[model samples]
Target chain A: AGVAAWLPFARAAAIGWMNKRQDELIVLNVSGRRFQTWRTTLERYPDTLLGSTEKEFFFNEDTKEYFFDRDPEVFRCVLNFYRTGKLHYPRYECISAYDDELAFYGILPEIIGDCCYEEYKDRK
Target chain B: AGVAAWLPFARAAAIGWMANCPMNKRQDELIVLNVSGRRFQTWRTTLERYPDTLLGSTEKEFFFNEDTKEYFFDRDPEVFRCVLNFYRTGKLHYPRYECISAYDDELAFYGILPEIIGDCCYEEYKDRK
Candidate 1:
């Protein structure tokens, strides 16, 4: 609900290590359009895949990629929520469905804007 | 920069407000987009139509990124800008441009009619099928 010790701050630079602090960035292949974001960002949201490893994530053994089927456009908002502690309003529509996706992904309802707040409530 | 109060709850809602808002249409109501990290600014009404578009369809909320203040898309910004022009003017045009095949695919992705595509690119549009 509140801020963490070190905020996202373009997390690619946030993560560090003493010996083996090397972290590999994950490829979120959303519905074919690929997006790259820090694993640390995904880890913050308990409801998303970064929060859980047991959940099945599509792993391509060839290029060594992970693919997830969802609206790549809306997924930007999801990734942004982790990057910056905010849930943005969807500019194209899909208010309710986006809410549902966020909920399924374990994004907390409080992060979203007023436009999605009511739907978040009803769905909760 | 300062916040624009005229920002749409849904970008679609912002346009309906614009039709009557008596304010400078060009200045007050605007949407910022970041396609593949390339930035663009344009009128909300220019994006109001086409319910199936990323800017259209009330079925789900659009992503207005608070951090960047721009809706992000994962497409080629150069081509996408030309796509936006089609909606803005109700016509697909490229005067001295090439890359008809690429434009055709982008237009179809945005759900523009093949007919709405300009004559210059018709051959590429048909050849794809």
Candidate 2:
């Protein structure tokens, strides 16, 4: 008889949990533009404002959407920081503006690249 | 020819050049730089004014990167980004932007004015000792 392998439901759970994960979808309306990512992504860094249990996140029950008033283009940089542990400045925009937005989101200053912060100094 | 029209070039030039401009002529001049092996192509006017940075002060009238045809610097490419950024923004805002401290040595190497040294890193290191 062939050995019955125990895969631990890893493969089954991937398809089985699809429905559960979809229910956990978190949408962010930055200014007017919409962006989507997982709740756990926001939960990864417990110290960040969005990641905190304080529940500072705004929710629109009618549309099942989360709201944030920020530049949609800039929010892309903010959102990417959560998933990837780096904050990248595309082509070097204004650091004061970007730094202000990061502070508003309760992100730590250390996460930005030392190189990026140095570049920021040229403008100030 | 409006403000919005001027904004991208202005922003691009900030990343592009290293100095001030007269607003009309020489809009696209490039300054190619090779730090070790990493290459940077920027606006000449952007760097033209800062003729006293690490890139300058060579024996020759101009520091021409003979091999790569780009300005050369025998420096850590990683550290030079911070050094260049200081020139870009007119100040070194943070030395310990990371937990460990090293920018001070780099600043000293480049003769950069440490307008804002990391006051916290020294205390943090002192506590660890």
Per-residue lDDT of A1-124 in model 1, one digit per residue for the tens? 2244356665657568425355567876654456787667667766565456733555656647665444455567878887877787654333343555576567765767776666546533
Question: Highest lDDT among the candidates is held by which one?
Answer: 1
Q: What is the per-residue lDDT of model 2 for residues A1-124, given as tens digits with 9 covering 90 to 100?
A: 0112355455667774652334265788654456887887887787777778554446667657776544445578878888886777644344554565678778865577776656555544
DockQ of 2: 0.04
**TM-score, B chain alone, candidates in order:** 0.58, 0.52
In angstroms, how far off is A95's CA in candidate 2? 1.9
> For candidate 1, lDDT tens digit of each residue in B71-108?
87777776665566555534454422446677667766
Docking class of 1: incorrect
Model 2 earns a TM-score of 0.39
lDDT per residue (tens digit) for residues B102-124 in model 2? 65566666665554433423343
Q: What is the interface RMSD of candidate 1, in Å?
A: 14.7
